[PDB]
Amino acid sequence: MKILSLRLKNLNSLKGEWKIDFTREPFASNGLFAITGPTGAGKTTLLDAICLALYHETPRLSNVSQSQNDLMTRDTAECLAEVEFEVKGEAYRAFWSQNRARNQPDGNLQVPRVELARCADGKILADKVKDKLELTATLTGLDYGRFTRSMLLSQGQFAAFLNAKPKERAELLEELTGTEIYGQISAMVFEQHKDWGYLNSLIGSKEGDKFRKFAQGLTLDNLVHLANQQLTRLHGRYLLQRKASEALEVEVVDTWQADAVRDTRTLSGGESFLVSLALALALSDLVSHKTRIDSLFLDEGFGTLDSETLDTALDALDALNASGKTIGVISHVEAMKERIPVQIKVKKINGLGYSKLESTFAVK
Amino acid sequence: MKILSLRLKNLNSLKGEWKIDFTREPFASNGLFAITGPTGAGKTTLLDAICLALYHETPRLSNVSQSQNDLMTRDTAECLAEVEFEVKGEAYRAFWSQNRARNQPDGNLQVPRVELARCADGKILADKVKDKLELTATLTGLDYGRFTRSMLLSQGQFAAFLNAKPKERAELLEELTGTEIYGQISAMVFEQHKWGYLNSLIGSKEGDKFRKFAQGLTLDNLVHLANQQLTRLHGRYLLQRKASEALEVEVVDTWQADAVRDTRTLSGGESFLVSLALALALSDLVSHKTRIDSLFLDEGFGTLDSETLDTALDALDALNASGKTIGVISHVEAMKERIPVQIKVKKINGLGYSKLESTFAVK
Amino acid sequence: MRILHTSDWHLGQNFYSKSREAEHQAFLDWLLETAQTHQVDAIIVAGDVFDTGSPPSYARTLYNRFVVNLQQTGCHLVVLAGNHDSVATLNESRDIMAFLNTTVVASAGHAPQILPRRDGTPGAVLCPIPFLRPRDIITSQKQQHLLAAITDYYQQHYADACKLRGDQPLPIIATGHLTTVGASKSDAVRDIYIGTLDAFPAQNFPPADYIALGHIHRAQIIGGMEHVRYCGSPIPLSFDECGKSKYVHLVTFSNGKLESVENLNVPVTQPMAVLKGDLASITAQLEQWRDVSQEPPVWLDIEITTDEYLHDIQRKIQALTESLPVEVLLVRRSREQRERVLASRETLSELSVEEVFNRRLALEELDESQQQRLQHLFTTTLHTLA
Amino acid sequence: MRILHTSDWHLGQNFYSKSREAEHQAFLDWLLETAQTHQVDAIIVAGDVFDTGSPPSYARTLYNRFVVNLQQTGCHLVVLAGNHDSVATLNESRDIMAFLNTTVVASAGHAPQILPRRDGTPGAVLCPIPFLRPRDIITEKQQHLLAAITDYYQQHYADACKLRGDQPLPIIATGHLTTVGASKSDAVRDIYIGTLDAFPAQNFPPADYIALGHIHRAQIIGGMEHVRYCGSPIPLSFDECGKSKYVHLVTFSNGKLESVENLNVPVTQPMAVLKGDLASITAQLEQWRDVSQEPPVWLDIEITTDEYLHDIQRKIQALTESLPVEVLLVRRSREQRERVLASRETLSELSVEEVFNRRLALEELDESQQQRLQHLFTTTLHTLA
Numbered sequence A: 001m002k003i004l005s006l007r008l009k010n011l012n013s014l015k016g017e018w019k020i021d022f023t024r025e026p027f028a029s030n031g032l033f034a035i036t037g038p039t040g041a042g043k044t045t046l047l048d049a050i051c052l053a054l055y056h057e058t059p060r061l062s063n064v065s066q067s068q069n070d071l072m073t074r075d076t077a078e079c080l081a082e083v084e085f086e087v088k089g090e091a092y093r094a095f096w097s098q099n100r101a102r103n104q105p106d107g108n109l110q111v112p113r114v115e116l117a118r119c120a121d122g123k124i125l126a127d128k129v130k131d132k133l134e135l136t137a138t139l140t141g142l143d144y145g146r147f148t149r150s151m152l153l154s155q156g157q158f159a160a161f162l163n164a165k166p167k168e169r170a171e172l173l174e175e176l177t178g179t180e181i182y183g184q185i186s187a188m189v190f191e192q193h194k195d196w197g198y199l200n201s202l203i204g205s206k207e208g209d210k211f212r213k214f215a216q217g218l219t220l221d222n223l224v225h226l227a228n229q230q231l232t233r234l235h236g237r238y239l240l241q242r243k244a245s246e247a248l249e250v251e252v253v254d255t256w257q258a259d260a261v262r263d264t265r266t267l268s269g270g271e272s273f274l275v276s277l278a279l280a281l282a283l284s285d286l287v288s289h290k291t292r293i294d295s296l297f298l299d300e301g302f303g304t305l306d307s308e309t310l311d312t313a314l315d316a317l318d319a320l321n322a323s324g325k326t327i328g329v330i331s332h333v334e335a336m337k338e339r340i341p342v343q344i345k346v347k348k349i350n351g352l353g354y355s356k357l358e359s360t361f362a363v364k
Numbered sequence B: 001m002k003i004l005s006l007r008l009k010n011l012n013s014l015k016g017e018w019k020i021d022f023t024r025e026p027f028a029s030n031g032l033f034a035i036t037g038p039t040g041a042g043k044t045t046l047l048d049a050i051c052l053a054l055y056h057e058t059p060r061l062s063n064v065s066q067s068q069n070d071l072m073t074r075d076t077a078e079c080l081a082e083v084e085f086e087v088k089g090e091a092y093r094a095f096w097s098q099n100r101a102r103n104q105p106d107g108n109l110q111v112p113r114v115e116l117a118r119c120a121d122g123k124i125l126a127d128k129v130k131d132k133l134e135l136t137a138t139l140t141g142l143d144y145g146r147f148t149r150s151m152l153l154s155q156g157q158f159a160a161f162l163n164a165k166p167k168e169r170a171e172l173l174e175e176l177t178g179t180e181i182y183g184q185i186s187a188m189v190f191e192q193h194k195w196g197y198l199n200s201l202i203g204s205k206e207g208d209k210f211r212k213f214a215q216g217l218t219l220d221n222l223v224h225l226a227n228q229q230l231t232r233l234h235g236r237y238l239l240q241r242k243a244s245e246a247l248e249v250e251v252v253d254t255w256q257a258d259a260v261r262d263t264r265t266l267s268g269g270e271s272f273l274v275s276l277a278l279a280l281a282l283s284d285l286v287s288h289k290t291r292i293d294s295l296f297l298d299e300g301f302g303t304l305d306s307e308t309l310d311t312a313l314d315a316l317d318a319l320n321a322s323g324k325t326i327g328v329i330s331h332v333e334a335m336k337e338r339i340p341v342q343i344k345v346k347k348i349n350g351l352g353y354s355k356l357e358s359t360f361a362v363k
Numbered sequence C: 001m002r003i004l005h006t007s008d009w010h011l012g013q014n015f016y017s018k019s020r021e022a023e024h025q026a027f028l029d030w031l032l033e034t035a036q037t038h039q040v041d042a043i044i045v046a047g048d049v050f051d052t053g054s055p056p057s058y059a060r061t062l063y064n065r066f067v068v069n070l071q072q073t074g075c076h077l078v079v080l081a082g083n084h085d086s087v088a089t090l091n092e093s094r095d096i097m098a099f100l101n102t103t104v105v106a107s108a109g110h111a112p113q114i115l116p117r118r119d120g121t122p123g124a125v126l127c128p129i130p131f132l133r134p135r136d137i138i139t140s141q142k143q144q145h146l147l148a149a150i151t152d153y154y155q156q157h158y159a160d161a162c163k164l165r166g167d168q169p170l171p172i173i174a175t176g177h178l179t180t181v182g183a184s185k186s187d188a189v190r191d192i193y194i195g196t197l198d199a200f201p202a203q204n205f206p207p208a209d210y211i212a213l214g215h216i217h218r219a220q221i222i223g224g225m226e227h228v229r230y231c232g233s234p235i236p237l238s239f240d241e242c243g244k245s246k247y248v249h250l251v252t253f254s255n256g257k258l259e260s261v262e263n264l265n266v267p268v269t270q271p272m273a274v275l276k277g278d279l280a281s282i283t284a285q286l287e288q289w290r291d292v293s294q295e296p297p298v299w300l301d302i303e304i305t306t307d308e309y310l311h312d313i314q315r316k317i318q319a320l321t322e323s324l325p326v327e328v329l330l331v332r333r334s335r336e337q338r339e340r341v342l343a344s345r346e347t348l349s350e351l352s353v354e355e356v357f358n359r360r361l362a363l364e365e366l367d368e369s370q371q372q373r374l375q376h377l378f379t380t381t382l383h384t385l386a
Numbered sequence D: 001m002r003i004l005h006t007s008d009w010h011l012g013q014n015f016y017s018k019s020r021e022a023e024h025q026a027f028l029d030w031l032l033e034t035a036q037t038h039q040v041d042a043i044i045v046a047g048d049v050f051d052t053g054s055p056p057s058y059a060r061t062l063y064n065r066f067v068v069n070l071q072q073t074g075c076h077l078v079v080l081a082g083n084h085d086s087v088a089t090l091n092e093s094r095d096i097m098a099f100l101n102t103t104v105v106a107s108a109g110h111a112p113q114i115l116p117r118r119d120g121t122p123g124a125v126l127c128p129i130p131f132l133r134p135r136d137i138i139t140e141k142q143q144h145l146l147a148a149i150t151d152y153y154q155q156h157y158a159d160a161c162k163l164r165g166d167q168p169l170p171i172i173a174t175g176h177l178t179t180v181g182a183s184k185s186d187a188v189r190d191i192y193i194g195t196l197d198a199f200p201a202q203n204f205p206p207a208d209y210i211a212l213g214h215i216h217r218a219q220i221i222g223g224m225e226h227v228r229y230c231g232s233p234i235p236l237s238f239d240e241c242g243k244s245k246y247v248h249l250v251t252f253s254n255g256k257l258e259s260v261e262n263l264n265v266p267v268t269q270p271m272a273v274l275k276g277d278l279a280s281i282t283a284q285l286e287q288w289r290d291v292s293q294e295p296p297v298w299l300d301i302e303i304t305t306d307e308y309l310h311d312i313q314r315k316i317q318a319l320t321e322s323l324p325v326e327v328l329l330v331r332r333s334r335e336q337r338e339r340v341l342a343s344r345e346t347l348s349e350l351s352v353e354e355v356f357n358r359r360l361a362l363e364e365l366d367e368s369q370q371q372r373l374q375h376l377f378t379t380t381l382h383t384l385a
Ligand SMILES: Nc1ncnc2c1ncn2[C@@H]1O[C@H](COP(=O)(O)OP(=O)(O)OP(O)(O)=S)[C@@H](O)[C@H]1O
Pocket: A012, A013, A038, A039, A040, A041, A042, A043, A044, A045, A070, A071, A072, A073, A074, A155, A332, B261, B265, B266, B267, B268, B269, B270, B303
């Protein structure tokens, strides 16, 4: 699961039709890039295009139906988002368009049309919102809930994976590593016991659960090790630690006190942003057989950090520039525009109300 | 509903006997103050001390009980929060506590030993969590779900009043103006009609329709006040009441030929500015029933860039000539010189604890 | 001695996502060569140098480049702090600007100093008064309070300058940055002192030889007295400010008294227009630029007084403005419309239940029978329940 | 001619919510009077002047006051840019410092310039090399960037050698990078974290002096006496003693290097690190039981043993009531936290038996139980494989 390109048209204050491509020359080299602009320029629109083209939804507007399309640009006839994404060497593309009636800037909102092609053999795979949604959920493995948990941390909700409930975290770790055989092995021991006395008690093997919980705990321990490797540069005070409970759950260790452990819902706003950024960057660097999270986009949390903490965290952000992953950060802060070389700049056009990107990304 | 003082003890990372009083010298003069410190210093702790002492809760921590007292400071045997608040001319003093087992830094948590009294009498109004909760819900008028959208906007949730569902907004407008007699009038017309001209115009079933009209009028006054505030902060948007039976506001975009769109399509910084304007208009509202005097912001100023933050901060100086005790919280370095009256929070040497001032310790 | 007087530069201002760097660069070049030619000894910027408190990089580039090119002339720049300028940013670089014949006064309470003339002679004495905050002049503490505070501050500093003048008749030039009673106010002017003292009477000013003021972006004389004078911005900082009345004031003193106040105008480098009325009036005014070759396009805005806004108006204005060298900035509706939209406090705690009933009848188009039959049916039934 | 060479000031550094303003003010006063006394002709700061990219107000106050008090001497300050220093802030005030006998360089690509001595005679030339960004110089990867830095240095030494003509002018070079065999500390952030690990000393061009600094402890690279570090003039991260803080007064002779005098910087605020168990902590606290020192020395208690679980900070504060010391930290030690890795690639290729092996490792297995339970597991995989 990686993002190759992104094509949108009249999605928000971005009028016209634009296309960015992460396999072109500015993005393939560095990997880490930024999206920089003033307040209200159109920065979150380029992530809502991804969420719209994949899951028919954006984190602000919960539906874009026949009724209530609050997305499309004022006095325009139509909109379309279209993403290209690669999973396991297969380069699919998704599509989402909607027209008003008779090309009028005010009319009846018609029915959206969707594609979800394969684009290698050029075949189509869906034509309805149900078929497209279940095919992408079984194709990438990421539902919309898990997408906002892992691959896209939206604005104001960076703590979706750190402060999750245990069942959502369990579903995400179950999707990263396919652990059906760990339940399958721990299914037959319920009958091979019915020595198998001590083994079926140690390896809890009733319906294929406790062994699978052990596999999830091991994946979480590897993830927490990677997270502390990332976190020792960003904020050196805390450390993640998979706590001892029957439900898999992490908590933070405050090294500045004795070693006193406490849960993640007691951190600050800026500290919680740093811990959640560390956890997301660990989840990017983790490798597995089932699904892989290569692309990663995150909205602004950097305003919550003050000056020196922002300097430390942004100096520690350059370690990914020597990688092949496409981490795409988004903020407006004046420190970020010089610390990061490869940028997407969003400019408002003269206070008319619309906006535009840099001139390469125009579809012409 | 006005916060007079606030006294806390060992709450999150403060570890002391701190007490601030908003009727002393540096606060009664200006009104608008700020709480300034570095990252992780303890700024939101003073802000959830009041919601702990009033509603036994916190925007982060849902339950604070004998099970899982997650806030009380490490290597500490006790914690207490206590707020003084006035309403309709008279004062009250809410109180909350906790102890460990045997005054030891580890042990079993106990019963929180909560109380609520009235000042100038010493009369203990309540002693249990249920009786104190219903007593403050009928005393101040507003419970926790309205407190975290009218009087205190927590960190990251500044849009609790702008982006609310219509029933919560309806409950808050029902609490600001008592529309009980507005229901009695058009309940009578449901029976006095046997004429239907009145029972079509203000024609209700159980008095609700006339109350809907009174709510629409109160909200239209509130939206007028909000646009008066908003014309300085961000001049692009305006608020207006929707043409619908449910009380919903939405934004007129003055730049794009006054095109009208809803509030859940604004930006992050723009949504902060509109919600700040609306919350400031809610303080300048006046009624015969539970007016909102104090106001505490938490964050949002990081979402504004520099050339918007300066305009918003220059528009914030308009309340130094007021009696409202609006207090703001941020860490942004542009704010430490704009605002003269400040509460500074310091970290003591990187031990992990913190302390704020010398004039605020009780001893 | 000949000084120059200017104010309200607003460097690094954001004007509807347009940078004013070219106009400020041309004006600073022009001011350099003009102050060299007319043999000026001190330039006085009386406030609002930078637009924000954290200006961009190119604004600080402009201001540093201007100060470093000033050294070849031998002048002596004086920079004050308006109501936009951050205090600490100027107070850091105060001591390092003092080594470049440049005095920067931002806080309140500087001792009045003595300007040199271009040959080192002690020419004039000035009272550096920046925009006074309402906290560094007032005690712990309304309108008369702040007015008397500013008044005795001015009287105190003028007294100290009169004492420092001594036997030798030298002009004392008071400075300032505030608004007065005869003020042609505008839109770029953020309103200072919004809670108290919305104006300042001109007769409270002490009798100095010249009083160089700021904060009003149009050249104006305050209360008839010539020696008290705004100088205004050197470029249009809004749309209501006309592009011709953009003056710098060359002030020539003589023998301790004021002699000449010459208003020399700044040449335009970026014209801007305002277009009001109906749509056909907009077309008629757009017919002006129908043929002229104009290399920097004229940033005009559209105000539409009628109700033609609600259609696809930006389509129409854009399709009109294809062929012209224009580059329209914005298409807003009207200020004068939004002046009249305030025909509506009057909260419902004051407003009686019959008045809420009266606001209900006003939304209907009921006649005098229904305004008396339905009213009398209502107005008795209040007491029959309550 | 005489230069003073110092580096790595880190002005406005935040050191566990303590400001180092008094120590920097004392050091800058001392450097002014030393530059007056020892008849120096230039001062060179090789990078890391400011700690952050948006330093506080008092840091810029300190730096401006130092530059303006330098004007009453006839000296000449040269300021480089480290890995901490923001580029555009230094580039804004580039030419307004040139009117104060002060030159700053932040970007890459300045032409090497001559220096005057205190009587206007051209004394030496220098090729100013700041911290080169990995986006600035370039257009496997490690030898690519290594060769890029190498040919950059060769190019600028070639241009400086061409600029010197046939005149007695020594070449001084600058730098802010890490090299092979470097006493790295914890204040030192890591540069080129994906590409390089160090820089070979033989890749430097030959010159009369090569003034570097990134590492905050004074040392010599290899054996080349003309190539020296200077390190910070104050302690920065508790790993540095209060004796190795030197400023190198370098004097030249007729076009070649003559002497590098290591005059030391006096201490104003001392530090102290305390390791071991609590009784050895008390025994190390014994050495302050009587002495009256007016600036309290900042402690860093580090516990090595398993006394971490007890109420440490109350006990340590109750100890440190009487003696006039001041505590900044109580921690489990780094040497404890060095070996807490004890590991781990992934579970992707990792077999279910190795998952089962990690299950058994938490148990109390015997050689029966590692062969009765293990044989039951290894069969039941291949009853289903
Ligand atoms: N239908 C629409 N047509 C045109 N513009 C719209 C429409 N809906 C919203 N907008 C505006 O589009 C702008 C872009 O908002 P965003 O892209 O979310 O802001 P942003 O880029 O995230 O900047 P931040 O997050 O505040 S720093 C907002 O100012 C909206 O008011």
